[PDB]
């Protein structure tokens, strides 16, 4: 086989064509991932002077189900929090912020939640997706240890109440939440725990993230039969913030 010029043959032409195509593909891939969080801002909420080397993408529209409307991106930030109890620790950019009051109650840091829609997520038939087991026709524990009726122990070693029910996702057949009834000494009413934050044993159920005295301030659902996305985010973030804010020794260097 011959060359076009010098040492240039068909393999070289193919290689350079792939180089050009890959450069265009990298541009497309990086531009496609900029539909959330832009334009950039500084630490005072103003638009930043630098916006980077890539321009922003054009708009796409999503047609949602069950008559929820349309979504156009990139657009305005509708999940933005309004009044955050935070304080700057420096005059410029690049330094951390300090909570003004109680970080766990104010939803800041690892306890932060995003302002999602105030409606439950639906399944294919238009029904709420997560339902307590006491109202779910045909479901039963088929494997593992059933946690209903067991006491719950906090991270500091206190018994705070008993498991009363389980909330399940019927479409995917999975347990999502555990429902806890509190003793009068540790609060009143019922609270929820996400399944990924518990360890179920033979005689107890352990939640290590928070202590007993923190169990009365867990956010509460409005209806006893359904939970919206906003409540889900606030409940999950509350438990997640305890990994750092439960004790002062969890925040300081471990060395």
């Amino acid at each position: 086989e011959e060359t076009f010029f010098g040492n240039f043959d068909l393999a070289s032409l193919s290689l350079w064509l792939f180089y050009g195509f890959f450069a265009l593909l990298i541009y497309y891939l990086q531009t496609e991932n900029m539909r959330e969080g832009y334009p950039l801002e500084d630490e005072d909420g103003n638009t930043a002077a630098n916006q980077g080397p890539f321009p922003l993408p054009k708009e796409k529209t999503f047609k949602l189900q069950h008559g929820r409307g349309e979504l156009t991106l990139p657009g305005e930030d509708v999940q933005r929090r309004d009044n955050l109890a935070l304080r700057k620790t420096a005059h410029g950019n690049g330094f951390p912020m300090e909570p003004t009051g109680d970080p766990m109650l104010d939803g800041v840091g690892p306890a932060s939640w995003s302002k999602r829609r105030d409606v439950p997520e639906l399944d294919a038939h238009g029904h709420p997706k997560i339902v307590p087991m006491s109202a779910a026709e045909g479901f039963g524990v088929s494997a593992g240890t059933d946690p209903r009726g067991l006491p719950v122990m906090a991270g500091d070693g206190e018994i705070v109440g008993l498991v009363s029910d389980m909330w399940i996702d019927e479409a995917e057949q999975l347990v999502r939440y555990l429902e806890l009834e509190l003793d009068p000494e540790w609060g009143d009413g019922k609270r929820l725990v996400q399944r990924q934050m518990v360890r179920i044993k033979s005689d107890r159920v352990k939640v290590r993230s928070i202590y007993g005295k923190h169990f009365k301030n867990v956010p509460k659902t409005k209806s006893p039969n359904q939970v919206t996305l906003l409540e889900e985010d606030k409940i999950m973030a509350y438990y997640a913030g305890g990994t750092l804010y439960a004790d002062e020794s969890r925040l300081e260097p471990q060395l």
Binding site: R35, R116, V141, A143, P147
Partner: protein, 325 residues
């Protein structure tokens, strides 16, 4: 320690799901009958079945079983119909492609005719499974990403078995049907044409394979760390951004200076995986037809290293000194 989410603590079972439907009436061709496996349910879903039976799937199954039995029966007859020897040498037997002297003409059944008949039945089977993957998206009213990703691998399949033998002018250029015999083909192909390390498209294919495995370790680990915020429900996170997506993005932004979105990471994954067989097939198609010695090509294009020291064991030691005498 905290729960890690690799195994489910407690399982729940309800009525079996039969699937969604629309005006295309997918129920008419679905089998009735389901099962449940509690061993699998420790990791994923426990329900087994049902499955859809169209004509594409039935044709694919029938023609693929035919290919398997022509190969298996040829292997059995090569050994004298001895079942214990058939079991003893299973990994070593194969159905061999034709001899180079026959070109692209039809060879004797003893010397590659059964290989060509069986290759035609495997071809038909594979193209039918792809038409099924396209039809089901069309019937489900979804995108065609799965079919395109499958066609990406079918491209290298066809290059290895159909296109390159035709451009080279011999059916003898095809791959044998065997476990060990097909690995011997790989080594012999690499040796015959210089060194396949110095084929640039082979290097690009390795780049994309390494990148695809690094990305499932990163994506799987990242999604498992945000499951305490509902991060495994990805579609609703796309339609309504939550704190799981924000934390997942900020982890990588603070780690390496840039990040992705919930929807956009799957495009990255789709492209790296798809790019491996495309570059591999382009590299294979250029061998023998254009370039015959890849190491001499590298020497010509000046990316072959040079070494100063000498060759030989007696340039470094002595035979008596290596034995302890």
């Amino acid at each position: 320690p905290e729960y890690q989410n690799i195994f489910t603590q407690v399982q729940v079972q309800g009525p079996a799901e039969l699937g969604v439907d629309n005006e295309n009436n997918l129920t008419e061709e679905r089998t009735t009958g389901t099962g449940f496996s509690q061993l699998i349910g420790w990791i994923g879903n426990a329900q087994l079945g049902p499955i859809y039976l169209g004509w594409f799937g039935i044709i694919s199954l029938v023609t693929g079983t035919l290919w398997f039995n022509i190969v298996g029966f040829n292997m059995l007859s090569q050994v004298g119909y001895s079942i214990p020897e058939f079991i003893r040498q299973l990994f070593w037997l194969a159905l061999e492609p034709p001899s180079p002297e026959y070109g692209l003409r039809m060879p004797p059944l003893d010397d590659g005719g059964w290989f060509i008949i069986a290759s035609f039945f495997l071809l038909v089977s594979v193209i039918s499974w792809w038409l099924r993957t396209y039809q089901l998206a069309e019937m489900h009213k979804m995108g065609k990403h799965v079919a395109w990703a499958f066609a990406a691998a079918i491209w290298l399949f066809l290059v290895l078995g159909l296109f390159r033998p035709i451009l080279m002018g011999s059916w003898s250029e095809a791959v044998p049907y065997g476990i060990f015999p097909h690995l011997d083909w790989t080594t012999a192909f690499s040796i015959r044409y210089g060194n396949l390390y110095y084929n640039p498209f082979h290097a690009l294919s390795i780049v994309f394979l390494y990148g695809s495995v690094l990305l499932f370790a990163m994506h799987g680990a990242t999604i498992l760390a945000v499951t305490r915020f509902g991060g495994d429900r990805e579609l609703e996170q796309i339609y309504d951004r939550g704190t799981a997506s924000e934390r997942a993005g900020l982890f990588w932004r603070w780690t390496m200076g840039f990040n992705a979105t919930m929807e956009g990471i799957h495009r990255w994954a789709w492209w790296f995986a798809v790019l491996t067989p495309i570059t591999g097939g382009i590299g294979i198609l250029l061998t023998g037809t254009v370039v015959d010695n890849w190491f001499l090509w590298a020497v010509e294009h000046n990316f072959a290293p040079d070494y100063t020291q000498d060759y030989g064991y007696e340039a470094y030691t002595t035979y008596d000194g290596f034995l302890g005498r």
